[model samples]
Every structure is written in C-alpha cells, then in structure tokens.
Target: YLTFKPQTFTYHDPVLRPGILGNFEPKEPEPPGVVGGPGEKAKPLVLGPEFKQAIQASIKEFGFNMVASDMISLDRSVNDLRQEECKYWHYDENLLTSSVVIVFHNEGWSTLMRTVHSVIKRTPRKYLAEIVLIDDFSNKEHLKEKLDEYIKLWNGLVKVFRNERREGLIQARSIGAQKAKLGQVLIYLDAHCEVAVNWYAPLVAPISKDRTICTVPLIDVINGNTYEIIPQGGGDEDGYARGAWDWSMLWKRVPLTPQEKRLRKTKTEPYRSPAMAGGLFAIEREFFFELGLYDPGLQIWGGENFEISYKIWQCGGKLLFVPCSRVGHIYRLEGWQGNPPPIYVGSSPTLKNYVRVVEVWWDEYKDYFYASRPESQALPYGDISELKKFREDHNCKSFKWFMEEIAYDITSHYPLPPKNVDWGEIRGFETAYCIDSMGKTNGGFVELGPCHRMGGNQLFRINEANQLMQYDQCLTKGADGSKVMITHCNLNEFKEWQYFKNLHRFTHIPSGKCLDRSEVLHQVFISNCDSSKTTQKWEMNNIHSV
Candidate 1:
C-alpha cells in the first residue's frame, strides 16, 4: 500500500465578524460565521479592512526591514488578506500534489517505456507522488520479466499491480485509482502515449481551483515523420474529448462551441468538448473514487471512454479540453485480431454495453447510432440492466444536460448537398438475311435444268443499325430471277447502351466507367442503365457535389 502526507503551509487567523457572536453555537462554534474555521467544516472568512491591516503587520515584522521600501510589500499585503478567505485559496500557494495512474495491457514495450519515461522526465518529482501501473492481466512475455526489470530500474518510483483475471479498461482504471498514493489528483493516460512539456500543470491546475474539474490534453498524432493535431469533426467526436475520427473513423477533435468561444475570448483556450479522449485525461483522485471510478462492467477498451465522459459531465464535474497541454500518440491501424474478443461478442447481438449507454443517458439520441448503421444487429435491450444500476448508484446527471450544456453547437456547421454529373452518354445494333432459288420443270419438250441452290445471306449489324436483303423464286431457261426484299427493325432501346464520361473515357451502366479497363471500381460511381431519352441524360443519374 502507498501512503501520502500533506505538505504543511502557514495559516493566518482573521478577526471575528460582527455577527459571529450572535450566531455562535456553544458546541458547534457557529460554523465559522465569517470564514476561517478548522477541520473539514472550514468556510471562507471574508477579508475586510481590519484583517488586511493585521496581515500586513504580521508580514512586515517577519521579514527584513528593507521590505517596507519595495513593491514586494504590496504583494505581501494582497496575499496576506487573500489567504484569510477560504474562497480565495489557491493550491499553487499550497503544496498540493498528485499521483499518476496508468493502466497497461499488452502494450508494446517501446510505447509503454516511452510513456513512463516521458512522465518521469516532464513531471516535477516533487509534484508527482508515484507512478502506479496496473497490468490488466497481460500475458505478453515481456510484461512479467521485462516490465518488472524496468520497474526496478526506476528505483521504486514505479509500482505495479496485476489483476488475477482480465478486467476491462474501466475496471483496471478503478483498480489503479484504489491503489493511488492518496493523491489530491489522479492523471490517467494510455500505455501508448507520451506526455508533453508542461502537461501536468494544465491538467492539474483546474483541479486545484475546483475539485470537480476534469481535463484533457490536445492530442497530436505521431506519424513516422510528423506530429500533427488530428483534425476535428466527423464521427470521431462520438468518443471522448469531443474528438473526431479520421477517414478510418478514428477519434479527433470537435470544433469550438459558443460557450467555448466565449471562454476563448477571455483566454485563448481550446473548445470545451463534451468528453475527454480516454487516451489521456486527469481528475481529482478522491472525486474519481467518489464518482465510483469507471464502470467495472464496461467492456475492456470500447465504451469506457464514453461512460466516463458522460458521467463526468452529468455528475457535476467540469470537463475541459485544455489547449496548453499537448501529448503525442503513435497512430496505428487497429487490427481485428488485436481487438478484445469479449468486446466483439458482447457489443454485437447483445450490444450489452451500448444499450447501457442508451438506457442511462443517450436513449433519446439512440436513433442516431441505430440510423447510422441499420444493419448492425445489436444485443437485446434487456442486457442494459447492469448499466442502469451503475448509473443509479452514481446519481449521474441527465442526458439533456450532456447535449445542451456540455456539447458545442455543431448542427449548422455541416456541409450541404449539390447538383450535376459532368459526363456524356453513348448508344450500340445485329441482322440476318435469306435467299431462295426455284427451277420449275416445263413441258416434256422443255429441257429441265437441275435445281440450283441459292446462296444464304448473312448480315452483321453494329451500333444501332440493321440491313437485310433476300432473293427468291428463280425460274431456269430463258426466264429471269425474281428478287425479294426483307426489312427488319432494330431495337435501339434495348441495344442502346449508356456510358458516362469518366475523366477522358466513357463507362457503361451498372458499373462506372474505369479510367482504364484496369482501374478499380467503387459503388459510388455505379448506376443503372436507362433506355428512355430523359433517363439517358447524365444529370438525372450521376449528379454529385463534394
């Protein structure tokens, strides 16, 4: 078990208020009617003229005689009076500190190592009590030996806790919180992430001001060559941090909202997002456990972020997206095999976890997820009972507050549809002919010639045209042969094929035209072939805008 001790700070007493004696209780000490009281019941004692003068006298006598000659005297005067009122209490003047809890599971050794090293290098040793790493039942070979070896290398600055069985990310987080060294704040980060310079200040600063504050850092993607702020918007905002996903639907950031804009005016702060990217975030350690930590039943990696984000906002906590702090995360493609099997099985057909989200807070917007993916077969709705129980236990705020208060206005920022298909149309036709020759035997005196066979006719048609000719009933001797004509109608409607202009060439219906025959096809370009002239127009079928 880890233990923590609060640092000592000087305290000053203020003169009792005028009404203090009137409301004074013989046993309860009147609850500090004017401010500074001892124990947890301490209240903000208002600073007045008398209190200010008394503080100034105390500061002057404790210091060098030259103090009266400098601007430092004014600073002392302000701080002395300010310290009397509990409302004006600032943790920076107080020696408040926090513990960092990082939960790891099967994270690559390099990423995990960097995460630890980054925190150690960036966070001041005095402010950080300890680094607690909870291994969520990782069976990786390096985790047991190699990880332990590194822990030893850190000279006991690191502590490791392992679960007997696999608990999801939420549960692991809960376990880590329980093991924290009684810190005033708890900072959580993923195993694959690294801290930015001055990261700890922004994250913990808010908490020092208000115990209910939670914050997230601006996340930068560390590709091989560059570190870029992930784009905001798109479906990625559905996750924590109001962050959006990439083309692959990975989470990113959300644009600033009206409230956030107002906040930015006072101070250039990032938009206040509805949620924090679970990848990196921080909260008051005691409030974390008091809020019941993460939902234990949430599947390992999925939905945990949403659960925490929703709970934080709904439970009277202020979640902020702090711009001053930034962290770099190595972005990589998620593989199917790497996904926890339980999440796949539970989220589907049962959607037990997702249903929990709906039952507790997102029921009204439930249609959003359903409409987005209609074919997805979700788990039965009844499975959310556990989640409902969790919500009830935590006394979370209503979902209405989450949307109306937490999220920024984004409905009007989306793009609109446009019209037109910049392509041309094309139209292709076949025919057969026959010929017959007849020789009639005349009277016995007439010499009869052997019947001659007529040549069969063949005609080939292309595009949308047809031609046919016939010869028949030929009489031998001095007679002449009679010729016949046959006409055939070409069915242009059935034969006319429509092709769309694709770049420099044309493509056929049912399939978009390929730039070349070898070009890959996508469903977006494919369209049905129409025989009617009106339907043949490209504008009718292929109109699109970016």
Candidate 2:
C-alpha cells in the first residue's frame, strides 16, 4: 500500500503528447537490485534501540553520520554508473592527477572520513595526486589526534588542514585550493559523499585539452533518509537536459534544445551548461591561480557558484558537463537548522554575498537582482576592489554579452516572476483549445491542445515586461521564426508577447509578426500575422470557458 520516498521521488515522469519529450526520467533506473553500498545488501540492525540514541545524537550534532558510517567499514562500496554510457567515453592517458579537496566547515568525523576513504579506494592512486581536507575549525572530538592516527592507511596521500579560526566554506575552500600541490588539479566536493566509478578520467580529460575549462560530473542523488544512490543530471526521460537558472538564481535542469541534442555527437563530447552547483568541479591549478579563483569578496556560501560561472564564461573559459563522469551526492532533507552553537557568527551571508555578485557581475543589469529583492539595494556587500581589478585585467565580457552570446538560448525561458497576476492557460477565442506551457518547458514551437478549465505548467501570466509568463518565466523563440520556448523572462523586447484587436491574432511586438498556429498540427509560430489563410484568433483570459 505504501513505499519509501526514494521510490517515489526517483520515479519516472509522465510521457505525453507523442511529439514532445516523452518517457522523461530524472536519472536512469538503479542497477537491478541494490541498496546503499559497501554493507550487506540485506542487513537487519533495527533490533530496536542498539545505537539509536547515538545515531540520533550524531544527526542532532553534525547533520549526518558518525557511527552509522563507522559500521559500514572505511572501505565502503558504491554501485557503478551506466556501463553502456561509459563504453563510448574516452579520456587522455596523460591527464593530470587531481588533488581532491574536501572542505568541511565544522563537519562530523564519520561522514567526512567515509568521503576521504571513498576517494582513496575508488580513485587510482596514480590519478589521485593528493586528498586535501580543509577542516573549517571543526570542534568535533577525534578530529584532532584520533583522525591524525586514522589517516595513515592511505599512504600519506591524504593531508588535513584546519582553519585557524571558523572560516566558512568560501574561505575554507580557498585555503584548500592554495594548499594543492603544484603539479595537481583541484577537485572540490562537499565533506559528506560517496563517489562514482571512473569519475576522474572524463572530468580531467576536457580540462587537459583546455586548461581554461571547468568540468563537472553528472551528479546522481543520494537519498537523505534511505541513503540510496540515485543517478541525476539527466532529466530522466524528460529528454536528457542541461542545468540553467532564472533571474531569481534558483538552479533548474531544462531539456536540451533539439539542435544541442544532435550536436552531442557522443555521450563524451561534454554538454555545455549555463552554470554549476559549485561544490563539485575540477579546475586546473595554474589556471585557477591565474583566474584568481573564486570571488574573494564572497563571504561564506551563497553566490559562489553563480559568480564563478559568470567569471568563467564572460572572462575566458568554458564550463562543460561530462555525462560519463558521475558522482552521487547526498541530498540532505534536514539542515543545520539554527544549531551551530554561538561560534558560527557572520552566518547567513547569502543575501550579502548575492548582492555582491549583482554589483560586480550584473553591472547595469544588477536591477535584475535588486528589483527582485529590494532590500538587496541597501544590503552591505563587501568591497570588490581586487575583483574589479581582476575583471579589468582579464578583460572579461560583461554579463550582457554572456547572456546574449552564450546563455541566452537556454535561460530565456522559465522564471519566478514579479509575484502577482493570476496564473492560468492562454486559450484560443472560438475553438475548444488553448496554448500550453508543458510543451513550452523544453523546446521550440509551442503546442496547443483542448483547454482544461484549470491548469498546470500550462499556466500563464503577463508580467510588467509584457512577456507571456508563468510566474516570472517568459515565452521565447529563435530569430528565424522557426523556434519558440518558454524561458526566463528577459528585457529582450522580442520575447515580449504583444496583443491586438478586430482581426484577432497575437503578435510578437519585437518580431512584428502574427503568432500563427498550425491548424491541425497545433504547432504555434511567428509569421506575417495576416499574410495568408491561417486564422490565428487568440485570447488572454479565455472567456469561451468559465
């Protein structure tokens, strides 16, 4: 009658409307039958209260495991990534060995060591030059000499450095990056994780080809409660996608454009992405130093990834996603909800940090940040004197150029809009049909169908920018009049969906054409509004239905 949330959350999405991306799934299915790795597949330790108190105590204290991982052995196991996917992937034999950096800000020892030992076991020692664990001043016991005693097994490849004081992940990561040996590349991960098989080669190969590029794996999800490893990054059967963002800066995975899908050529060709999640990635050591690394002005956690993604693309490099390289991340259901003792001050640096990204990177378009969050205008962001200097020296293109030249295609759809206005479907005036958003979520040529009185993603609203939107998202299309997609609402006047009267058809104010629909095909597009036969009558809040 019931199932665990993992079974439900990782379940395949619904396939629909034959022509659209049907059979969509977030991750590929699990490898037949397997539970959490390393331990016996079928273990029975629920014998009531053996160490329940300690498990609860650890969760209460450090967020994840201490003793739980201890029971699973230091040499714990992980299931493999797809064999079929890996078969086609190739890497350079001479790729540089990586100094894996695990940054821990007051982290628990158990989960942290499991991450360390995972690297030691799975990564070939030759490929793993060093493992640098940055202890951001953890007060947990045994993180002292006990840990010192424990690290001997990895043959000195593991090195631990403690922050002199409580520096957060931003600074702590910098401390670790600086410590990376000269010959190594730096790969940063959160402190609690189990890595996937052959994750190293594909990630580093692209970088070896172009040291200016940053490579990240297709991250699988590790269930927070069940500890199940779930493959991620691919948009399930939802047509294999790439990561993108809206003006609000929330990360989302949108389906790949059909053209990009054809261009993939091989699974190993590195899918270009709009941005990364930040915690997990590899960058060349020399290039990192030359690029000046992460934003020095960023305080603790927030905006670290977004700002860097901007700096990478606008400045001089590429951000690529290597699907063959996979890493499983534990998506914690619970968080450090106000329990970091008095020592963790200057926490909640998210707002302050975000505003700084806007100030420096956003430049004139900083209004996208401030207008969305007005208080951000008054928020005290630290000075960016050095960042400005770095930007000037790097001769980076502005955020405007980055959006127009590179990211504009992917992100111009979907948004968390200015927050008012009723959200519902846009329908045709005389027919039993409506313009839909489900088809818009992915690629070109919006589809139309019978109007359902209520709505889902088919939901629509017009924002102050005059762009047809769902929440803050906007509807967009290619310049050739051949493509249309629901995208992040933009200042681009062309994306603005404009209206009309007696003749009764919607026109893209910028394209200055009638929004025409393929009568039988239900495919919507732009062309000379009244050029010929197509009767393209439209409505805002459809009055034909209730």
Candidate 3:
C-alpha cells in the first residue's frame, strides 16, 4: 500500500442558514417502467401517439428529449460503476475542501438541479465547502426567481451567481472562480451531469499532496433521451487514456504510454495526461489563479481546453486522470437546430479562440494547425498581444518542449498534416463505377456506385502511411474476411494496399490479391490477381506520388 500524507490545514465548521440543517437523503424510488426509474428506456412515450408532437418539440427545443427529462426525478439513482478496488482505497481524512462551480446557459431544469443534488448527496459534508452556481445570463423561466426559490432547501450551502451580461462558457467560469470564497480547491462541472460514488476525495486528494497537481475524472455517458447512465468503454489496464487533439483542433484520446503503464502498480491509481476534456476538472484555488484561470479573450467554448492544458503542462504543473472518479454526462441526441438561439451570431468564435491559442502557445508548430484548417487562416482571431505577454510573464516553456517532453507520442498517433500519396475517387477500370464510402462511419463497407463527379462520398485518399482512408476512417478488411470496410486506422500492422500504375491494379498487400468488383452485386472485395482481367483493375482520379 502506498502512503503519502499532507500537512493538515485549518478546518472550519460549515456555515448554515437560520432554521436550516443540511440533510441529504436518498430520493423515493419510481417503478422500473416509469421515467427516471433505474435502467428505464424512453420507449414509453414512443408507443403513445398522443405525445408525438410533444416529443418532436422537446427534441427541437433542447437538442435532447426534454419531455422525457421533465418527467424524471431530480434526485434519481445512477449506477455505481467504479472498479471494485476503488472501494477499498482510503484517503487522508483532511483532504482540502472544495467549492463546486457549475456554469449554465438556458439549461434544462431537471438536468441542472440533478447536477446540484448529485454533488450534495455524493460529496462528504466536511470536504464540500459550498456549491457555486453561475448563471451565464440564462433567460429561461425556471432559472429566474424560480431557481432561487428551489435552492432554498439547501439553505446557504448552494449559492447562485448570475452574470449581468452573456459572458460565454470560458469567461463565465472565470467569473465563478473569481467569486468563489469558501474553499481551498475549485471543482468545475457542466450543468448536466451526475457524479459517481466517493467521487470527491479522489479528485482533491492529489491536490492535497501537491498544489500544482490538477485532476480530471473519467467521464461516463448519460443517455440524453432516457437519462440512463452508461459507462464509457475502456477502463484501467485497457489503459486509462489521456486527452489529446489533432492539428485541426479537434479532441482526441491517446492511450496511456508503456512508461505510464509501468509506473502504476495498481489499476486505480492516477495517471498523467497531456491535455484535458475541458468540461470538468479540479485544481487548487491559489494554483488556478497563479496559472491565470483561463485566457479571458477566448470567446465562447472553443479551444479553452487546449489553452489551459498547454498552460498547465508548459508552466511547470502536472495534470492527472483520476481513474477512481467517474462522472456521468448527458450527450445531446441532435445538433441544436434553433428553439434556443445561440448567444454568438457572426463568424465562428470557436475558430477565433483556436487562433488565439496557437498564436500564444503553439509557436512555429501553429503552422500545422493552419495547414490542417487553411480556411480558418483568414478568420479574424482578434488581438492576442496580452495573451503572448502572459506567456512571457509566467516564464513558460516553449510549445516544442511541451510536445517533445510531455506529448511525445501525439505525432506518431495523429501525424501532423498527413501527406497523401493519392486522392479523389477510386474508380473501377472495367465498370467505371466509383468506390463510394456512402458517408459511412467506422465499420461500414465501401460499395461500387455511380461515379458522381461532385466528390463527397466518393472521395478517398491513400496517405504516406499506406492506409486507405476516407476522412479520418481507414479502409480495412473485417475479421470475417472478403468485405472491405472503413474503420479506425490501426497504428500497428493491419491492412495496407498498393497501387500499380503500369497494370492499373490496386493490390491488397497482406493477401497479395487485387481489388475486384462484383459482377452480380455492388460490393467490392479482394480476389486473386488476374493480369488480363479488367474487373481486377482500379484507378485513382488523382495520384500525387505513388
């Protein structure tokens, strides 16, 4: 057993409002078939035609099934999906107190309250100093006096702060962090989430030992429609993955390095991460301010994750993934169409934020980000003078040092501006039908379709790594064999193909067979090479190299 203790800090009794005692009790249970009940699906309303329009409007309004969420209890039971070993582990009884900071804008009532209730219920009273709710200028009816009236049950334990004007997510969080006064550590959470059993101590424990250490929990999924808690696949030993990003500024997950795996003696221990998912984390209040909470210039919620993550790693601090702490988050079913209009109207604020991040932190490697997204190059990314000065003021290390010493394997996992050998449509020499991915996600087979010159689903590329890819997904043969499908590119040995220009044949290198088009069906498969048969030959619309 590993034992490391921190010097104890002064402990204070929790403050309470007049005639109020903070009492948290398990909520009354609902029947299994009813909404918000344990493990219930959202099928009850789909069978009833009376709620047809209600369901559609609910989905349109919130980008999720709001009608269903309205019926669920605010204090509902979520499964305890933590690893068995986590239960046996103990932490110092004197872990630093935390102020839970949640920021919301036009959020659902049940979802938001449920987030508050979950925190109050799961957190130890001694360690939870207060719950600070930041209303990012939400104009919702329930959020006005109604929200104030509801939180009265918790007395002064749950506090609320309203932004006078719309400040966006990044700035709004700064507002909450600035206003928080009750705790030594600050824990940030989204409006729609439910924390798991004993989630609080694991997050604050590491910070207690070292103030420079910030922690993030493993984010599990909550079904948007049914409110079901679903644990995200891949746990400890499967390698607790860390947050990463491609050059295009999109989020990615990179598995724990072999060195990281070897360092941990147990599966439940905390591990190092290069970046964070941005939605959630816990950091020391003093360290947070010392590192500069967040780049205030970062408009809405775009690249703040990278900005803070880079700041933490480059400015001589450590960020860790707490495997024992898991929080369930609701992912919306559909993209917000319009019922609740977005606060920002003009050109993408997110892209502008990305530009600021690269300008201040990315350095010369910012070219890779620009190369991947050339269109964003022209977008007005406002002045970043102060942000650059902030970097120099902190005496922060260079981005190159961060990439090499911290996220060394990032380039190997997601190459910077992957050079392509060939691109455009892959057409059959005999049939003239183009190989169309049909805009499928991973694991869908490519088929022979009418050659559409417009180039959408028909577009394909073979990169310098020799993987046949469509967008980010790569073409490969399934375990069943014969069918050519697009899947996540396997970095290690899998399937690879080569184009022979002289014979107009594309050979599957592993099978030593050529890509053959089916005569009876639209399927494309691999078969024995036949030099004379045009059915076994293919050509790419544009070949850059080989």
**Per-prediction backbone clash count:** 22, 18, 0
Tens digits of lDDT, candidate 3, 257-333: 88777787776778888899998999888888877789877887676999999988887788999987889888988
Candidate 3 regions exceeding 4 Å error are: 1-52, 234-239, 335-345, 418-546
TM-score of candidate 3 relative to the true fold: 0.72
lDDT of 2: 0.64
Per-model TM-score, in order, reads 0.54, 0.67, 0.72
Select the stronger candidate by TM-score from 1 and 2: 2
Cα lDDT of model 2 by residue, 350-426, tens digit: 66787777777877777555445433455457787888777877688888898766676654465334432223456
Largest TM-score belongs to which candidate?
Answer: 3
Model number with the top lDDT: 3
Off by over 4 Å in 2: 1-54, 65-67, 233-240, 335-348, 409-412, 415-546
lDDT of each: 0.46, 0.64, 0.76
Q: Return whichever of 2 and 3 wins on TM-score.
A: 3
- Please give the range of 10 consecutive residues that has the lowest summed lDDT in model 1: 74-83
